[PDB]
Amino acid sequence: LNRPNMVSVGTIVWLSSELMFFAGLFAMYFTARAQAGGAWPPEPTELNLALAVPVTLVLIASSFTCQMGVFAAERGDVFGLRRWYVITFLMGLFFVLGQGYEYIHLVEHGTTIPGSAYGSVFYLATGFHGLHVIGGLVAFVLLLARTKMSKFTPAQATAAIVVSYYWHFVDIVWIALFATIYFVR
Amino acid sequence: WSDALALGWPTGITPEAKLNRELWIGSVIASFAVGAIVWGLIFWTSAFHRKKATDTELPRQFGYNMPLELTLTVIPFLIISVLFYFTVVVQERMMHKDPNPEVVIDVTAFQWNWKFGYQKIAFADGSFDYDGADPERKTYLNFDKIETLGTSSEIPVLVLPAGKRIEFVLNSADVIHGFWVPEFLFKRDVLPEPKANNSDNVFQVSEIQQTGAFVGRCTEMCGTFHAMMNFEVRVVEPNDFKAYIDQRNAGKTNAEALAAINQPPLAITTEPFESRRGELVPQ
Amino acid sequence: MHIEARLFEILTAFFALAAVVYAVLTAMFATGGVEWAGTTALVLTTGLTLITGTFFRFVARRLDTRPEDYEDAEISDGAGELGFFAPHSWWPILISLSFSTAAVGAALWLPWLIAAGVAFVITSVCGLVFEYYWGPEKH
Amino acid sequence: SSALLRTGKQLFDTSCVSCHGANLQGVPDHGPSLIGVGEAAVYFQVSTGRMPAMAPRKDPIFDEAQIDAIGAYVQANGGGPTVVRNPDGSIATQSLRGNDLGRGGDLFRLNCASCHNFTGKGGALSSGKYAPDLAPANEQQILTAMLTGPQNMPKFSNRQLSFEAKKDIIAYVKVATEARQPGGYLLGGFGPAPEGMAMWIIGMVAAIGLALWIGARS
Numbered sequence A: 001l002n003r004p005n006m007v008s009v010g011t012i013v014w015l016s017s018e019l020m021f022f023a024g025l026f027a028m029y030f031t032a033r034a035q036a037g038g039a040w041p042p043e044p045t046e047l048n049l050a051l052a053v054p055v056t057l058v059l060i061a062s063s064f065t066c067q068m069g070v071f072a073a074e075r076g077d078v079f080g081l082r083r084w085y086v087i088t089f090l091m092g093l094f095f096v097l098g099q100g101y102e103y104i105h106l107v108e109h110g111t112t113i114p115g116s117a118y119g120s121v122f123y124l125a126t127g128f129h130g131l132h133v134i135g136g137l138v139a140f141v142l143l144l145a146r147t148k149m150s151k152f153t154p155a156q157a158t159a160a161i162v163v164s165y166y167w168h169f170v171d172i173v174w175i176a177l178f179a180t181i182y183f184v185r
Numbered sequence B: 001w002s003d004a005l006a007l008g009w010p011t012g013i014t015p016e017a018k019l020n021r022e023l024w025i026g027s028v029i030a031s032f033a034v035g036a037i038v039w040g041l042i043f044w045t046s047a048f049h050r051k052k053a054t055d056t057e058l059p060r061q062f063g064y065n066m067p068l069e070l071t072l073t074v075i076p077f078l079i080i081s082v083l084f085y086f087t088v089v090v091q092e093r094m095m096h097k098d099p100n101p102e103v104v105i106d107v108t109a110f111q112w113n114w115k116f117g118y119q120k121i122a123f124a125d126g127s128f129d130y131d132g133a134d135p136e137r138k139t140y141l142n143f144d145k146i147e148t149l150g151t152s153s154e155i156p157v158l159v160l161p162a163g164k165r166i167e168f169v170l171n172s173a174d175v176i177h178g179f180w181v182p183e184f185l186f187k188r189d190v191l192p193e194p195k196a197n198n199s200d201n202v203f204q205v206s207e208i209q210q211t212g213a214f215v216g217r218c219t220e221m222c223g224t225f226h227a228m229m230n231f232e233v234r235v236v237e238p239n240d241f242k243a244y245i246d247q248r249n250a251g252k253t254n255a256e257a258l259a260a261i262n263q264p265p266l267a268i269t270t271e272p273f274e275s276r277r278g279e280l281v282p283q
Numbered sequence C: 001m002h003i004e005a006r007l008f009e010i011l012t013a014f015f016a017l018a019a020v021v022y023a024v025l026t027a028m029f030a031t032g033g034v035e036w037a038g039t040t041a042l043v044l045t046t047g048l049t050l051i052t053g054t055f056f057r058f059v060a061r062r063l064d065t066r067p068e069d070y071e072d073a074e075i076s077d078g079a080g081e082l083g084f085f086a087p088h089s090w091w092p093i094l095i096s097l098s099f100s101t102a103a104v105g106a107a108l109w110l111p112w113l114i115a116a117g118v119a120f121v122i123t124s125v126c127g128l129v130f131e132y133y134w135g136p137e138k139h
Numbered sequence D: 001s002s003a004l005l006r007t008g009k010q011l012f013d014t015s016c017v018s019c020h021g022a023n024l025q026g027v028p029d030h031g032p033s034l035i036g037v038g039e040a041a042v043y044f045q046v047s048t049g050r051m052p053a054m055a056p057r058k059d060p061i062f063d064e065a066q067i068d069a070i071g072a073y074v075q076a077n078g079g080g081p082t083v084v085r086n087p088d089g090s091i092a093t094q095s096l097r098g099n100d101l102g103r104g105g106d107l108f109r110l111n112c113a114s115c116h117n118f119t120g121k122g123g124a125l126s127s128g129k130y131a132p133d134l135a136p137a138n139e140q141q142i143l144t145a146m147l148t149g150p151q152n153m154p155k156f157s158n159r160q161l162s163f164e165a166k167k168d169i170i171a172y173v174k175v176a177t178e179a180r181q182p183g184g185y186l187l188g189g190f191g192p193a194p195e196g197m198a199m200w201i202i203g204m205v206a207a208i209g210l211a212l213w214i215g216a217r218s
Ligand SMILES: CC(C)=CCC/C(C)=C/CC/C(C)=C\CC/C(C)=C/CC/C(C)=C/CC/C(C)=C/CC/C(C)=C\CC/C(C)=C\CC/C(C)=C/CC1=C(C)C(=O)c2ccccc2C1=O
Pocket: D193, D196, D197, D200, D201, D204, D205, D208
């Protein structure tokens, strides 16, 4: 029975809704850029492309690690699943820490949320994505803990798969945000 | 006879208002026709009651009449296309903005009152080259020399000439307001930063046929006393208008400048009712 | 699953057409140029429909006909054993109470209440996720 | 100067004249008299964003030298308290801070703590209104508020509370709102209500969790 997977359908449609949420955020950002004429990144702001690219590379690497974990999960092997998902969790935590460090260095040199119109849209566009990353990390921890406490079944496999493409959605959203904020300007 | 088919629309004091009223009456007649036909169909089909003589024979169970679907989907396209054509025509004929008006009023809306400016007068007869102030704009609001300011005890009155091209430039100090004079059959929102919000805060009327007093309301949501932002428009002849402008250039209030040309100095259409608190109030 | 994919594909086509038309017609003939809000909204609505329709198409392209996708199917064809459907549970109301606590702490700016609500949300979601997987107690 | 100040008040058709009148005698409908308060009342009411209104603290509209103008205008109509300036032209920041702390704390507990708190937190008053937290308040703002006595707050004249005592109280407040706590996490600055809540939600939860782990259930 169960020719298509039901948790998969649910996760896909919910990911679509979250795409609409990020649509709202992108609209907020794209407006008020057309109002800043000239040096539209204002008085004190300078983005650090020497630190923005490594964290993106780590995020893509984590996506690849998660896909490898999915491959390990499709065959009834739980230990490879665990290894690859621990690696993915660590890479994601490193991304989050790098983003926080960039936040600190950017806030102690000017740009703040109540300081300018650019700081507000920048911080809201990136912080909600960071929150989604933290949610994905929590999901990873819960999935691993659940694998520890019962026999490995196709339901466990399905859980791994749906968590994986949630992570992939987060990664593609970050790619869009990065391309929009650091290159297009 | 057409006073009933206008559903309460006041007869306009402006040619664009007259055109709008014609379009409105035509559309209302069309909608009444369609609604009457549909009501007739429903009330007719409500005579197909179950007859007691009807045996154990259900109705014809037909369903799925295919060409009727195409017919009833092709006619409403016709009606809506005709209405859209005429709507586009009238809405282009309602926002014209010729470059050479005769009077330019600067309307400013703030928290629960109005302020009018008299920016420029330039009559086509050849006369009345008036001007504005701009020594103090130090950033989007407009300041002039002859300004009519309303208060909670006196309602602002905007004196305008009859039969002249008038232009309005709308600006708000804090929040969104609305500029509705019902006799114009037209209204527009008053925005804080109209340029940074890509809005056209400028609109013109060709002439005002009648004379006298007309009311004006706010049509936004502004806060507590949103229902207490009324104003009045007084339309006089260009001679009374030159008399008023001169009596105002000589330092005089709006009420005195109005009493100088034999006009009631206070608003006769609406009255400056107190900022009320209730009926049982301890006054 | 042909009709689901076809529905979402029709929606995607219409949304993409509307998006591109609105984008170019605001690039021209507009008081300030591109509108930049409705354009983004329509583009990402098209993206939503595209994601869902593409997933459904990929699922349908590698699946045998189901008893509910085939007329002349019999009710004895679906005979078998369906999935697992949860009986009674009290974790949803606790999740809702935790989320409401965090929401009240965000409405009235109280960071201690926000943190307590977040911790309660984590705890109750853990309880919901582990409910049918805890083993017997090890004594 | 006083000329742009009159324009500051008069041409502020949105802000000033509708509530108080161009005579500054006070419109009976909207606003009080406003004839005897000096530049101190203006500097407190406007720089804290409480003035021109439609009453929590907000960000001020007028910033650049059009506050001191309106203050000089209000003062020129009728005398009153003035803003304390450093002998350079600016408004005093460090010079307003006193050196005596015990006296400042005694006077704070006697005259001020009854409404706000021991350490400057907020307080609850009757029928709605409250007393605010004193952490976001500036030092000239403390001085001017204590001089003018805003809504429901008593007016502490300079003849009943000397300027030296006011400086000591300012010092005590700025030290009580900026000092680290040598005990751990500050639980809000109130008494044992946060402490009892923390006990119930942290300590007792940890204890009952340890009991659930160690003991058996059946
Ligand atoms: C069981 C019953 C009380 C026996 C009655 C027998 C008979 C009727 C005696 C007559 C007495 C009648 C007439 C008067 C009653 C009042 C009187 C007896 C009070 C004396 C004190 C004493 C008896 C307390 C009663 C028992 C006590 C309240 C137990 C409640 C807690 C138990 C049941 C488990 C709670 C589990 C706990 C770890 C999780 C809850 C976490 C938090 C929300 C607890 C709630 C909570 C509490 C309990 C606080 O005390 C508190 C104090 C300050 C700030 C906040 C809180 C707070 O949030």
